[PDB]
Amino acid sequence: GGSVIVIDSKAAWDAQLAKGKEEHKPIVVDFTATWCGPCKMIAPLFETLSNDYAGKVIFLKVDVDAVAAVAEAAGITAMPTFHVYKDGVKADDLVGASQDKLKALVAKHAA
Numbered sequence: 789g790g791s792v793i794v795i796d797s798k799a800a801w802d803a804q805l806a807k808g809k810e811e812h813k814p815i816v817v818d819f820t821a822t823w824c825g826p827c828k829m830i831a832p833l834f835e836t837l838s839n840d841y842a843g844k845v846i847f848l849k850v851d852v853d854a855v856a857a858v859a860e861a862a863g864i865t866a867m868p869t870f871h872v873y874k875d876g877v878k879a880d881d882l883v884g885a886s887q888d889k890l891k892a893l894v895a896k897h898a899a
Contacts, residue, residue: 790835791842792818795850801858805876808846814897815846815873819864821853826885827868833887837894844898872897 795801795817808815818834820827838847852859852867862871862878870893872880882893 790838790847792835792838792847792849795848795855795858797855798857801848801850801855804846804848805873808873809876811846813844813846814879815848816894816897817848817850817862817871817873819850819852819859819862819867819869819871821851821867824867830868830885830887830890833890837891841894841898845894 793804795804805815818827818831820831822828834847834849838845841847850858850862852864862869866883868883868885870882870890871878872893874897880893880897882889
């Protein structure tokens with residue numbers, strides 16, 4: 789929901805990373821699974837932040853069930869995992885469902 793873009797393929801993943809690089813806007817990615825309890829707890833906040841920071845930060849969702857190859861390439865082991873991408877490459881990450889830490893991560897990289 790919100791302004792989150794659901795990634796459905798490797799091709800779409802690459803295209804969004806390239807757009808963030810061209811637009812000079814950071815990307816925050818939620819790597820998630822519907823069997824993961826904490827993922828469902830923090831997803832509403834991820835979507836709220838995607839609305840609050842729309843225009844400043846790009847928000848993507850990667851369901852590891854839908855795009856296993858992108859999750860594997862990203863080195864995910866625990867969920868939820870949030871990654872920040874700038875200029876095509878990983879710049880920061882945050883693991884777990886802490887609401888304060890997610891708010892801080894977005895504020896840091898939107899600045």
